[PDB]
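For reproducibility, we list the full input for the adenosine-3'-5'-diphosphate complex.
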Amino acid sequence: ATSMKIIGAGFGRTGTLSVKAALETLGLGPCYHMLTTFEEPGHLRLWNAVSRGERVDWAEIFARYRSTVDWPACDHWETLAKEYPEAKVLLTVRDSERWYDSFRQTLAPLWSAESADPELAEYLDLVRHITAHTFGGRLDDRAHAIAVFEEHNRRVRASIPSERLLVFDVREGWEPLCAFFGRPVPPDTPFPHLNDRAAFQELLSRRLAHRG
Ligand SMILES: Nc1ncnc2c1ncn2[C@@H]1O[C@H](COP(=O)(O)O)[C@@H](OP(=O)(O)O)[C@H]1O
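The corresponding predicted structure, in tokenized form, follows.
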């Protein structure tokens, strides 16, 4: 069977696309990511149902996945860790000021957009929901967004038994990730460094064009 082994609790802009690539290389995928929501039909509607508080069977989202990182799932780490008690929790972190610059320059413009494109309505509803419930409706307030990031990270660390949680900065490379799961380090392989910008812009254009 396909079993969920890793719940990613880190926010976007903490290297989650790189971690997705790394986990899949280690045989711990398929790994879910924000980008996956655009590749799985029905999944943005499922995530908005989750966001509204509907009863949603998590298997309808994750049955084919062994790991998840990034939004939208990272906001639901607490429920997911109870759903999947044998899964580890992976918290990716980053220094807060640089995290916010990354968030403000890449995600906030997308999340704050108005679009007349019907194909983006489900996505915008979802990231507006995240803006509302995780950020209290404000993305432009630097100190506030940083306070949300730091409290999110702290609440994960306070809530998950220590042996079940890895706190990881992607700048550390393979070694602590591999050691935590007891897997070998891939030889002569740099840790992935995926910017997670242009890939999403391509998925947006594919969705507007109805490609795939
Ligand atoms: N191996 C690595 N070392 C350092 N930063 C990395 C990295 N892999 C990804 N990142 C940074 O993580 C951010 C993307 O994270 P995510 O996939 O969660 O959206 C990007 O930040 P920047 O916007 O500063 O380039 C990317 O540069």
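Residues 12-18, 70, 102, 106, 170-171, 191, 193-196 surround adenosine-3'-5'-diphosphate (CB under 6 Å). Residues 142-159 form the longest helix (18 residues). Both points were considered when choosing residues for closer inspection.
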